[PDB]
Each structure stands twice: as structure tokens, then as C-alpha cells.
Amino acid sequence: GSVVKEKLEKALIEVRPYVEYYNELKALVSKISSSVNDLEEAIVVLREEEKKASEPFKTDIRILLDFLESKP
């Protein structure tokens, strides 16, 4: 089961004043969390998703991604 979900929910809140298309990014979060179990996994997904998805949404992917990287 996914522990990463509870981290991504907190991530969404704090990155919300920085990310555009919050509901769209939350939809991506619910998808990636359902695919993965651990944070390190969801991080690798947000790395690939940033590359394949175009901006402005690309930007919002890597804002949330960088936030997971930033916290210990």
C-alpha cells in the first residue's frame, strides 16, 4: 500500500501558492500514488512526467517534485 500518499497530500497544500492547475496536479498525484508505494518511486515518476509533459503543467510537476527532494 501507498505511504507516499500522505506526503503528496501535504506537498499539494504547501506547493499550492506556487503551482498553477492545482486540481490537475492533484489528479496526477492521485494517479502516481496509486501506481507507486514509496516516496522515492513517486519522485522518479515526477522526474519522467516533467520531461514528457509540456509547460505550464511541466513547471507545476517539478515544483511539487523539488519539494519532496527538499524535505529530509
CA atoms within 13 A on the CB side of 8: 28
Report the alpha-carbon distance of residue 61 to residue 53 in Å, rounded: 9
Report the alpha-carbon distance of residue 41 to residue 48 in Å, rounded: 11
Whose cell is 520531461? That residue is 51
Q: How was this structure determined?
A: NMR
- DSSP-based three-state secondary structure for 54: coil
Nearest of 51, 16, 47 to residue 32 by alpha carbon: 47
